[PDB]
């Protein structure tokens, strides 16, 4: 029992990380095979973040200009390009220790683990999740550049994200491995809001559940409602809508613990209605929404 | 900036991990060197949980009954011997992966991070405090015993927790690696209640200097105290005694802030006697008390 947010052990991709440095930038890289996956900004000087022209700043670049070193030794670049928002620098060497992998693009509510890194080096691994305004609530200092997001399945890294930018509001936008940015952010210094940060009502179903399987149940009441109704009070929460998807998928959940979906969907309407009244849920004083239905399975589970 | 909670790579620790088995009983081990420690109740059966003999059941044992898996390859034990609540089990190859490390008793209130495991696996990693009352609030399910807490100093791994057991409240209790529980527990079922669960202080204003290094201000009263007249107030809710130990190790915090440690003492005064009002701190609607003041600075700083 006990209920923690948890990461993904992060020994594959700690294997992964690499130190790429162009000109007086200095970021990470994930090299996978003998392709080294970066930020494109890394080929950013001062005074150009405001408006770069990565074409034309990278006709200025060439392989010898991009420093990758693993550990304390150098990688030789044999070939670069500029995929989206991305940099792959091919190296003469693959990867020993490259996983099996996958580039994934996840959608908003997902979660992942990050390997936050600075100059190549693993400094920690928390857990996040796609904001449903794409923007994640990350930990993430200067250099922290091109630390990734990813999820495991046994053997297999399904790399999801890479860190690009901290927006004026602290909040963090990135790529997919393919540089594809999540939402709307782009790579250059400018006035990029976000967009309503709404709370992802299925995985909080799913937190629900998870307290229920450990103990805490006195936020169970006597009430049912419909999708329909509950939605009237989501929305009226900032809440994203319930829809009968996120009914399925929490579908083994209300089978381990034997309450309907829709009665778990009432008792977190009375919960956004009521408030805690100073009590707490798995230890916490808010409706926690980083926990996936998949996660809640897992950690309920021991998957390893 | 963003604050998260992080645990350290675990990569280090994932090289570790091997699966014991005695009987029908399989737990995890860590290997270090030629030696693969776990909890001495691997030795144990369902006919003798409530009051085991270990000196008696273990003279019952061999090298041979000792089963250890190292991924899919099996490890030859050449030697058996109790540490007071860990099993030392001699096994004829050193592991390769054996890092730099220590073994360290810590102290309650810090803070370290457990590789969760499930037959020699690793399934996830989180961050957890030694509390004062000597638990440890885990996710930690049937399997889970010999999963380890450590902290890293650059390469060096210092091991300061071996899982044990789960006690009839949910929390956890486990011993350093030299088997000396953490706490009155011991290794047998039965009645075993925790004492209060008091807040870390100390911690509470590490995390509050890092909402204020992080923009989170709107809590800063223009109120300080004395040590003693928080040290009242913080007898009322259950908060441990901070001491000038404690006050001296905020200093960095203090310094970069800007905020005398005693005036942020009276800033935590006024959240425990008014409450957070429903708003939130670093995302908590409650006082976060699992991060230690090396913690803050490490993570405001990018220590890797
Ligand atoms: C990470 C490489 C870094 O230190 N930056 C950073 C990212 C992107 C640029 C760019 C303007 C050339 C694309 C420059 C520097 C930090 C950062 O995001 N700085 C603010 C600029 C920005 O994002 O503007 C968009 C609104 C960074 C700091 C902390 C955490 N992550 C990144
Ligand atoms: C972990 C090895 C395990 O599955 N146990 C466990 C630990 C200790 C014993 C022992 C009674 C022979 C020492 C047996 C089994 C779980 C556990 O703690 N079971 C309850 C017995 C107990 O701890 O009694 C003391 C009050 C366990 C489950 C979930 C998480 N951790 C451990």
Chains 1, 2 share one sequence.
């Not at 996978?32 to 900004?41: I, T």
């Not at 408030?275 to 996660?295: K, Q, V, Y």
């Amino acid at each position: 029992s006990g209920f923690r947010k948890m990461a993904f052990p992060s020994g594959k991709v700690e294997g992964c990380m690499v130190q790429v440095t162009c000109g007086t930038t200095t970021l990470n890289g994930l090299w996978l095979d003998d392709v080294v996956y970066c930020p494109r900004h890394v080929i950013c000087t001062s005074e150009d973040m405001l408006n770069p022209n990565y074409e034309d700043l990278l006709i200025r670049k060439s392989n010898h200009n991009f420093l990758v070193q693993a550990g304390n030794v150098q990688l030789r670049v044999i070939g670069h390009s500029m995929q989206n928002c991305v940099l792959k620098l091919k190296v003469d060497t693959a990867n020993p220790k490259t996983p099996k992998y996958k580039f994934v693009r996840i959608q908003p509510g997902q979660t992942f683990s990050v390997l936050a890194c600075y100059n190549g080096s693993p400094s920690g691994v928390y857990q996040c999740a796609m904001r449903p305004n794409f923007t994640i609530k990350g930990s993430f200092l200067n250099g922290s550049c091109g630390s990734v997001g990813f999820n495991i399945d046994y053997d297999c890294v399904s790399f999801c994200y890479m860190h690009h930018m901290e927006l004026p509001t602290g909040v963090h936008a990135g790529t997919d491995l393919e540089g594809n940015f999540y939402g709307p952010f782009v790579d250059r210094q400018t006035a990029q809001a976000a967009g309503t940060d709404t709370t992802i009502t299925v995985n909080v179903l799913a937190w629900l559940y998870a307290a229920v399987i450990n103990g805490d149940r006195w936020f169970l009441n006597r009430f049912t409602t419909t999708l329909n109704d509950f939605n009237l009070v989501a929305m009226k929460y900032n809440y994203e809508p319930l829809t009968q998807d996120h009914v399925d998928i929490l579908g083994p959940l209300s089978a381990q613990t034997g309450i309907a979906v829709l009665d778990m969907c009432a008792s977190l309407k009375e919960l956004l209605q009521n408030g805690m009244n100073g009590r707490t849920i798995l230890g916490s004083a808010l409706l926690e929404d980083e926990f996936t239905p998949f996660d809640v399975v897992r950690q309920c589970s021991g998957v390893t």
